[PDB]
C-alpha cells in the first residue's frame, strides 16, 4: 500500500509566526508566550556581516529599532537580548495561540518539518533530515530566515531548527532555539565549507523496511553480513557507519517484517555494489535516506 514523505500538521506553528524588521532587514520570528526568537544577523548591515561584533552592534540598538508585526497588529518590544546566534525580543503581550512546546537539539540523520515563512506569513510545509554534515537541503527564498523546524511529540511542539543562511551549494544552515549552530558554521561572511555529505545508512535501512511492509521485496537476497563487513562497503560508498544502536532502533521494523537487521544490511550491501538495474523501490530510482525508523513505524501502522 501507499508510502509518502509527510510533514507534521503545522497549525500549532502557524499561530507562532511573526514578522521582525530592523532597518531594511525583514525576516521571520517565533512568538512563544511573550518572547520573539529570530536570527541575530537581522541587526547587521551588509558591511557589518564582513566582521560583525554582535555584542557591540546589539548594544547600539534600542527596542524601537525592532518592528514586530503579528498579522496586521504591531507588537510592542519592551526588551532585546541575545542567546548565542538568536535574538530574543521580549514583548508586552503573551501569544494567545502559544501552544505547549519544548526546545530540542536533534541528532544528525533525524528528520523534522520546516514551516517555510515569508515576511512572517506561512507559505509551505515540508519534511527533511539534518544531513550528517549538519546542513539542511531546504527550500528557502530571501525572507525565509527565521522559518523553524519542528516535530510534534504527542501534544508537544518540539522546536529543533531555525534557518539562518544558505551556503554556496544552495544547502541551508541554522541553529537550535538556544541559538547554537548545527555544524561548524558562523553567522558572518567568511568561507565556510560543509563537510562531506554522507548517506544516512540507518534511514535507508528503515526505508527498505518500509518497501518490504508495502510489498516491494525484489532486492531481498539470501545473503547475510556482520556489522563490521557491512561498514567496510558503506565507507567505500560515502554511507555513514552503522552502529549497534542503529541496529537497536531498527529492531521494531525487523520484528514487524521478520527480516533480521543484518539480513537487510546484506540486501543494501548488494544494491550498493550492483545498483538497481533500472528498477525502482517505492517509486524511487535512488535509495531514500530522509525517513527515520520512527518515521516508518509512525506511517506503517
Amino acid at each position: 500500500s501507499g508510502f509518502r514523505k509527510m510533514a507534521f500538521p503545522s497549525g500549532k506553528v502557524e499561530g507562532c509566526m511573526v514578522q521582525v524588521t530592523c532597518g531594511t532587514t525583514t525576516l521571520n520570528g517565533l512568538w512563544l508566550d511573550d518572547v520573539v526568537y529570530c536570527p541575530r544577523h537581522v541587526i547587521c548591515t551588509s558591511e557589518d556581516m564582513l566582521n560583525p561584533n554582535y555584542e557591540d552592534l546589539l548594544i547600539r540598538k534600542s527596542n524601537h529599532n525592532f518592528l514586530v508585526q503579528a498579522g496586521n497588529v504591531q507588537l510592542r518590544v519592551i526588551g532585546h537580548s541575545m542567546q548565542n546566534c538568536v535574538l530574543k525580543l521580549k514583548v508586552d503581550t503573551a501569544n494567545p495561540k502559544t501552544p505547549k512546546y519544548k526546545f530540542v537539539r536533534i541528532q544528525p540523520g533525524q528528520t523534522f518539518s520546516v514551516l517555510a515563512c515569508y515576511n512572517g506569513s506561512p507559505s509551505g510545509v515540508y519534511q527533511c533530515a539534518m544531513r550528517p554534515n549538519f546542513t539542511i537541503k531546504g527550500s528557502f527564498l530571501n525572507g525565509s530566515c527565521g522559518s523553524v523546524g519542528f516535530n510534534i511529540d504527542y501534544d508537544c511542539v518540539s522546536f529543533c531548527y531555525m534557518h539562518h543562511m544558505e551556503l554556496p551549494t544552495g544547502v541551508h544552515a541554522g541553529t537550535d532555539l538556544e541559538g547554537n549552530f548545527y555544524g561548524p558554521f558562523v553567522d558572518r561572511q567568511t568561507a565556510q565549507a560543509a563537510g562531506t555529505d554522507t548517506t544516512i545508512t540507518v534511514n535507508v535501512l528503515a526505508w527498505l523496511y518500509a518497501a518490504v511492509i508495502n510489498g516491494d521485496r525484489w532486492f531481498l537476497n539470501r545473503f547475510t553480513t556482520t556489522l563490521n563487513d557491512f561498514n567496510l562497503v558503506a565507507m567505500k560508498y560515502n554511507y555513514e557507519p552503522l552502529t549497534q544502536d542503529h541496529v537497536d532502533i531498527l529492531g521494531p521494523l525487523s520484528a514487524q517484517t521478520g527480516i533480521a537487521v543484518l539480513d537487510m544490511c546484506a540486501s543494501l550491501k548488494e544494491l550498493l555494489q550492483n545498483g538497481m538495474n533500472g528498477r525502482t523501490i517505492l517509486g524511487s530510482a535512488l535509495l531514500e535516506d530522509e525517513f527515520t525508523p520512527f518515521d516508518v513505524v509512525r506511517q506503517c501502522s
Binding site: 530571501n142 525565509s144 543562511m165
Partner: peptide, 4 residues
Amino acid sequence: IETD
C-alpha cells in the same frame, strides 16, 4: 554565505 547568503542570508535572509
